[PDB]
């Protein structure tokens, strides 16, 4: 159950897109392009949740010309972020849940 795993993982509240997360998304844009298989030149960051780990996992709702997707992006305390996984084919209002 996605709601249950979101509790187990300790994801927080949904936050408005901000500069910190936009920079993280930009850092992993080549991987997003490959995973979403579409032109993401005008990708828009919508919102996100986080998990506090050794570093931070960001669960990010993004919008492209192909629709919405959720991204799991790992940011170590020191060093650039990396894309872990995606949930493609999301709706605008879908809850950000753990995956």
UniProtKB/Swiss-Prot annotation:
Motif (Secondary area of contact): 51-55
UniProt-recorded Gene Ontology molecular function terms: cysteine-type endopeptidase inhibitor activity
Family (UniProt): Belongs to the cystatin family.
UniProt site positions, description: Reactive site: 9
Name of this protein: Cystatin-A2
A GO CC term assigned to this protein in UniProt: cytosol
Xref: Gene3D superfamilies: 3.10.450.10
Superkingdom assignment: Eukaryota
């Amino acid at each position: 159950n996605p709601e249950f795993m979101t509790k187990v993982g300790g994801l927080g509240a949904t936050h408005q897109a901000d500069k910190t997360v936009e920079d993280i998304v930009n850092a992993v844009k080549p991987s997003i392009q490959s995973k979403l298989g579409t032109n993401i030149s005008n990708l828009k960051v919508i919102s996100y949740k986080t998990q506090l780990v050794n570093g931070t996992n960001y669960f990010v709702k993004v919008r492209t010309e192909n629709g919405y997707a959720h991204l799991r992006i790992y940011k170590p305390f020191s060093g650039a972020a990396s894309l872990v996984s995606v949930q493609d084919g999301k709706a605008k209002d879908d809850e950000i849940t753990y995956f």
